[PDB]
Amino acid sequence: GTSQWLRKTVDSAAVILFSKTTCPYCKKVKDVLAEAKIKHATIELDQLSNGSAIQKCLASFSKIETVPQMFVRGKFIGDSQTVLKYYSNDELAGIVNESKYDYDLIVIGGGSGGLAAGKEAAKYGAKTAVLDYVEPTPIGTTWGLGGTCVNVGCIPKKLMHQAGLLSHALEDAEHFGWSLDRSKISHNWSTMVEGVQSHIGSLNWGYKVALRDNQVTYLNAKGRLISPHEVQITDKNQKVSTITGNKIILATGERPKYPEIPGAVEYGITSDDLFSLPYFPGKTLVIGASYVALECAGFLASLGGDVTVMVRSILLRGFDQQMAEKVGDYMENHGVKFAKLCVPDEIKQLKVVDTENNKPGLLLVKGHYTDGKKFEEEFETVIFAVGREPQLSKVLCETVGVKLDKNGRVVCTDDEQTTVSNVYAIGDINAGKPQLTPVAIQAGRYLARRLFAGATELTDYSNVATTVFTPLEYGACGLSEEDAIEKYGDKDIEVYHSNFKPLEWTVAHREDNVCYMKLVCRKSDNMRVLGLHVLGPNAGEITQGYAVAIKMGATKADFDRTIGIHPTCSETFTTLHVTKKSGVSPIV
Amino acid sequence: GTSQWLRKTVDSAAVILFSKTTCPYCKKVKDVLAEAKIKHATIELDQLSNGSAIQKCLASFSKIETVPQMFVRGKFIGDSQTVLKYYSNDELAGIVNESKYDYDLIVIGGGSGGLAAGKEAAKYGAKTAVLDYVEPTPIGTTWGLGGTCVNVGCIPKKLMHQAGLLSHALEDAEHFGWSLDRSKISHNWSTMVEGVQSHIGSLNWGYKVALRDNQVTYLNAKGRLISPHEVQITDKNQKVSTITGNKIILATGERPKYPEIPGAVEYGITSDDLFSLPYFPGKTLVIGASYVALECAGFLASLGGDVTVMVRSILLRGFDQQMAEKVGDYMENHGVKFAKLCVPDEIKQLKVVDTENNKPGLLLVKGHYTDGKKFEEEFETVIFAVGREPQLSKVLCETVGVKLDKNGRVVCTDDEQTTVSNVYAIGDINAGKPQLTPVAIQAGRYLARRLFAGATELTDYSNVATTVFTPLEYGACGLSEEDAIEKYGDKDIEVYHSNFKPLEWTVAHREDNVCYMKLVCRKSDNMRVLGLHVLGPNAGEITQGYAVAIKMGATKADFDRTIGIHPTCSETFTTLHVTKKSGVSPIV
């Protein structure tokens, strides 16, 4: 019990001190380590339930039961007297740096999870390297350190979402008494892109500064695991070399897919290219129906574009389908066109992109509908958003022994361990886990603490809240209504729901019964809230706080006994009463 | 136990049917009652755990133990055979309208609480009257049905707040690429007031329709309780008369105070006047420091006004003072002037209000600072926001026996009962309760269910969340930091905090380290969250969901194990780690 925890902690920590807050011999050792700039983890035995048990188990490694005790990479180094002996004889630095490996930790992948993992490990004295390389897109787009979210994901996409939201603010401002005329204002794509890219560039630089100031080695190099402890690296001159590490974290992410049709790679683009595109896309076709597809179509339309979405089957597969249909209905009423039950067959080039005068090309898209009829129409830009995939064959040699699943993602235990004992996987490549930036960050930081500080806390992957940043935003936490009915049966599910209107929409003359919210509850478990859903402005700010209550097992009675804040959209959750079974209208 | 509940329920229900869902004799009685439009409460004995005890206890009133049993105003009417007999002999209508009083319920006050109470009572067959009268302000301002929030409170002030926020949206729009020029755009006060007042008028009308459609009698008349069951009414022609009711609910709210100085009533205004003023206030002095004072000064400055606030002692007395000071610092950085440690001595008229040309007048304000130096300055408008108070001497004869406290509010039990057993009080006049619209609504609806449908649930007044809608908003739930320390001692309190920057503020070049959040926790109670505080955009949307978790007893561990939604401001609560004791900086 306590015995096996201690063994695992000692064998894995790079530099760890067992201590008590009251002992001045411990403070004497802490001070010496700080002066020599030796980072390390510390376990305060007087602050743990069974510290007396641990203190006695230390004797199995050190043959002493007293405190302080200092270990380096699994080896007992000395008590107080012995540590100062090493310091006074100029022997300490060599002892704390001796290792079987170049690094205590190598992180392959410099994104959300990998940077979090690497920075947290370095805090406890682990010698860490972070590798990052951005393979260019087919048209050659590349970008800096920080991963998909920072450079070509959550960050630029929400900033262009905000640019779109501000067109409605301009319209609203007239009704609230401001003297502008929305009809005579236009948008400049390249001005927006310049401001977005300047912020992304501040994040690239911030991550390099953060790694330097944590003593993490950053190599802008492509890494490949060739044996459990050996990583082959290739630099910007295709210089190939090999570095070794005790623990390995795979954190390499995914990239967009293309459909296997003529012209797709040659003449279309993905979200990877959209966020630094030097010209306005113009008349645009978006192929696919994921949250990426709908978010991009949405702000392009709000910035004045002529936008079409080609849907093969349904919107937002895997999300609550009543909510997904409301999302699409709103964007169709505000100008996005939808080609339903439709897939593409080929893309033909009619004009090459005018890279001089900063203008898109021109393309002819041919496709067909699910019953047989034909699609044919011209667009200036075609954006594919038909999913994302890893390519671990680039990253990982099959002889190493790391098990993948049928989709190509890494099969892991609940502490992120692979089938190779010293290798771990986090973020989007970890099979079966929600593919989200805060998840990757929590997994990376918690894992680093278990490896190098003796921590025990695991990452909880259940009921993680989401928000889709469509022109009207959709926040959710927990089960969709159809998944709850499937799992428990229709007779055991009760659904409370209501329309609402934001107070901000009244004077602005916006729609009465379009925003909408519901709670999906289990009758036989005290009306436990299984899933929460809201369509409305600021949906992510609305949903976040409820994710804590749902984590704690909130029931409908908990929502009822809590008082609303007025006037807000969120307060409508505190007074829901119309059930779906009753048949009463949810309108207001 | 069961027997004391049953007698309380039978005595005060207006019309109540005891029933079982599986009984066709009960369905036959329900059907007759519906056809005759007889509204009534219903208790389904088969859906209660001690329904068997209640069934046998009914015999104490009816000498029978079967269902259905129908009662009217405390008297057993009959079983199935007897009710149908009364029906087909045309005697039922007269039976159910038999009463010792004109009304089962009289509500004095047509605001947030009183309207909620009256509509809910009428659903269970209580014959109900709602009285509402709006005493004009000193300059003559009056308004329609709905109370302070609807007409001169939450609704118009948040609409005017939104007009102020749109100022910054117009500014932010240029940085995100829109072609407008903020500096050439101005605001028209009367156009804003016209749109606000048109929405308020639709609320006035909607409440009158709601009372008509619930068969509630609405009397636009001033009420006075002269004995436990008699209410004297005075109509708009000064006709005086008396009506009687079984139960009385007092729900008359408060009105603004004026300081006792020369010129205040004659030449200044209050929030009651501000939301329908026909001219822009111009250069304005706000006297006071409540949330009313700061919210009003705030939107006035954003709409282009030259605004000063004169503060007796501190801002937002009774709220967390670190957050109060940050609220003030932001207002002052964006234009609002503050006259600290200062009070007014007299207001002098230099120009009368120009009601022809639609212009304010001009005033000379004289005052002094606490060290004795003098204040003297000219303003076009002076707004007093120096507190609110009930005036129950106009509502309630002293001989009735209703106890008041030192501030003139009604002393109530935790079920809203006064010292007169048939008389209840709800909303702002209920001593010691938070003075908020959703509290008054919850109190009123829960009380009507207990009086007329046999409910037992009480209103929970603890840990009610708030939001102050200053230009940068402040949301809170639970204890201030200084209150937590007073109650538990400094060593049992830990404070986690951080600055943050909304993503929307990056491209717009807004401030880096102004938004702020903290969690105030109790060490010896598993780091229980005692209070949550946040300064930033959409602070009410952010705070609301967390109020469910605090109601449930959330700890710091519950916040840590919940995952963030990215990118949002609210997610910063899920990763807090810097403590105040550590002395580490909270900047990002």
Ligand SMILES: Cc1cc2nc3c(=O)[nH]c(=O)nc-3n(C[C@H](O)[C@H](O)[C@H](O)COP(=O)(O)OP(=O)(O)OC[C@H]3O[C@@H](n4cnc5c(N)ncnc54)[C@H](O)[C@@H]3O)c2cc1C
């Ligand atoms: C358009 C879009 C919008 C999104 N919006 C959101 C949102 O609003 N909220 C949210 O939570 N999530 C969002 N996501 C998802 C989020 O971006 C991912 O979940 C997250 O980036 C995954 O982090 P990661 O560490 O697993 O991988 P990544 O962040 O992709 O980082 C992996 C890194 O490793 C590099 N790499 C790959 N192979 C190698 C190699 N052999 N050697 C070295 N380096 C290598 C990659 O180039 C990359 O830099 C969005 C995604 C997309 C595509």
Ligand SMILES: Cc1cc2nc3c(=O)[nH]c(=O)nc-3n(C[C@H](O)[C@H](O)[C@H](O)COP(=O)(O)OP(=O)(O)OC[C@H]3O[C@@H](n4cnc5c(N)ncnc54)[C@H](O)[C@@H]3O)c2cc1C
């Ligand atoms: C400027 C301002 C802003 C506010 N903003 C917010 C906010 O954002 N959120 C929030 O939760 N709360 C807010 N409040 C508080 C909220 O308005 C009150 O808590 C709420 O209105 C109290 O409701 P009530 O039912 O107790 O009384 P009221 O709503 O005041 O209703 C009482 C009614 O009874 C009438 N009446 C009085 N005497 C008699 C009589 N003798 N006979 C007949 N009728 C009579 C009154 O004229 C009035 O119509 C604000 C208040 C103010 C002043």
Ligand SMILES: COc1ccc(C)cc1NC(=O)Nn1cnnc1
């Ligand atoms: C693929 O589904 C859509 C695609 C585009 C859009 C615009 C909407 C939908 N949703 C949808 O069908 N809406 N709806 C109409 N009547 N019932 C539901």
Ligand SMILES: COc1ccc(C)cc1NC(=O)Nn1cnnc1
């Ligand atoms: C006619 O207005 C009323 C409406 C309803 C009622 C019950 C009374 C009045 N009496 C009235 O004139 N109010 N008043 C006071 N100071 N100026 C005007």
Ligand SMILES: COc1ccc(C)cc1NC(=O)Nn1cnnc1
């Ligand atoms: C009455 O207090 C204020 C009044 C007006 C304003 C504008 C601000 C405050 N707050 C305040 O004192 N801020 N501060 C400065 N250094 N420590 C705290």
Ligand SMILES: COc1ccc(C)cc1NC(=O)Nn1cnnc1
């Ligand atoms: C965004 O700041 C402004 C810009 C322009 C102007 C003319 C005003 C503001 N001030 C602002 O936020 N409103 N306000 C009210 N009380 N303090 C501040």
